[PDB]
Scaffold this active site. Structure first.
Site, mmCIF file in Angstrom:
data_model
loop_
_atom_site.group_PDB
_atom_site.id
_atom_site.type_symbol
_atom_site.label_atom_id
_atom_site.label_comp_id
_atom_site.label_asym_id
_atom_site.label_seq_id
_atom_site.Cartn_x
_atom_site.Cartn_y
_atom_site.Cartn_z
ATOM 1 N N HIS A 226 -41.931 14.304 -21.048
ATOM 2 C CA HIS A 226 -41.604 14.349 -19.462
ATOM 3 C C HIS A 226 -40.756 15.340 -19.224
ATOM 4 C CE1 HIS A 226 -38.753 11.973 -21.825
ATOM 5 N NE2 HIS A 226 -38.003 12.083 -20.613
ATOM 6 N N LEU A 227 -40.615 16.158 -17.585
ATOM 7 C CA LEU A 227 -39.733 16.881 -17.392
ATOM 8 C C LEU A 227 -38.234 15.991 -16.202
ATOM 9 C CD1 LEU A 227 -39.483 20.259 -16.803
ATOM 10 C CD2 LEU A 227 -41.061 19.750 -15.146
#
Ligand code: X7I
EC number: 3.9.1.-
Lengths: 115, 112
Positions: free
Chosen positions: B98-99
Site C-alpha cells: 500500500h502507498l
C-alpha cells in the site's frame, strides 16, 4: 541538459561527486549526504521531472522502476529487517530539490507517523 | 494470506473510497496521521514491496500516478508525502502493498 539543472542533474552528469549504488539508462541510486537512518539513499530518474505533482501519465513505468530499483538496492545493501520509501511533494511534503526522488531509509526502527 | 485490505477490495467491509479502476483502489485511512491520509493499493495481492516482480513496475507506478491525481482532487495544493513501508523496521502494518499519501499539514524530517 540531460538530467536538468538541479544538483541531481549534476550528479547524473558526473559533474559533482556522489556515492553511486546503482545506475541504468533510466535511473541512478546514490547515498544521501545528510542520512536520517543508518542506511539512507535516493533513487532518481535520469529524465528531469521537477516533482511528482507534474509527472505525466506516460511516466508510470519510470516511477515504478524507481521503486523496483529501490527495493533491489535495499536487498543488495542488506536491509533484511525492512525499510521505508518516501516521496515528498512541495512545501508541506518537504522538498528542497525539485527533481523527483525516492528516499529509501533503513537499518533502524522507523516510527509512526512518518514525519 | 488474506488481509483486511483484501476484504476492502472485495467490498466486504466499509471504507471511504476515493477512486477505483480495474487494477487499484484508493481509500481514506482508518487511522489518519494528517488531515488528509489515504492509501492507494493494487487489487493484485502483492504481500510486500520486497517481493514485487519486475513485471509489476508499471502497476507500482500506477499507484503513484493515482495517488498524485487523488491528492490534487482532494485539494492538497501545498504538497504531500507518499510512503511505502516494508517489514518490521519499515513499520509495515498490513501484508498487502500500500502507498500512503498524507497532507494538510507540514510533514517533518526525519520521516519517522
Ligand atoms: O528534497 C528533499 N526533501 C527531504 C528533506 C527536506 C528538505 N526540506 C524539507 C522540509 C521539510 C521536511 C523535509 C525536508 O530531500 C532532498 C535530499 O537530497 C539530499 N541531497 C542533496 N544534495 C545531495 C544529496 N544527496 C546526495 N548527494 C550527493 C551529492 N550531492 C548530494 C539531501 O540531503 C536531501 O535528503
Amino acid at each position: 541538459r540531460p538530467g536538468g539543472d538541479t544538483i541531481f542533474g549534476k550528479i547524473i552528469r558526473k559533474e559533482i561527486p556522489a556515492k553511486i549504488i546503482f545506475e541504468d539508462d533510466r535511473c541512478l541510486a546514490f547515498h544521501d549526504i545528510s542520512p536520517q537512518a543508518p542506511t539512507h539513499f535516493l533513487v532518481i530518474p535520469k529524465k528531469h521531472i521537477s516533482q511528482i505533482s507534474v509527472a505525466e501519465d506516460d511516466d508510470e513505468s519510470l516511477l515504478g522502476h524507481l521503486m523496483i530499483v529501490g527495493k533491489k538496492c535495499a536487498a543488495d545493501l542488506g536491509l533484511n529487517k525492512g525499510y521505508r520509501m518516501v516521496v515528498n511533494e512541495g512545501s508541506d511534503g518537504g522538498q528542497s530539490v525539485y527533481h523527483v526522488h525516492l528516499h529509501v531509509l533503513g537499518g533502524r526502527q522507523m516510527h509512526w507517523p512518518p514525519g
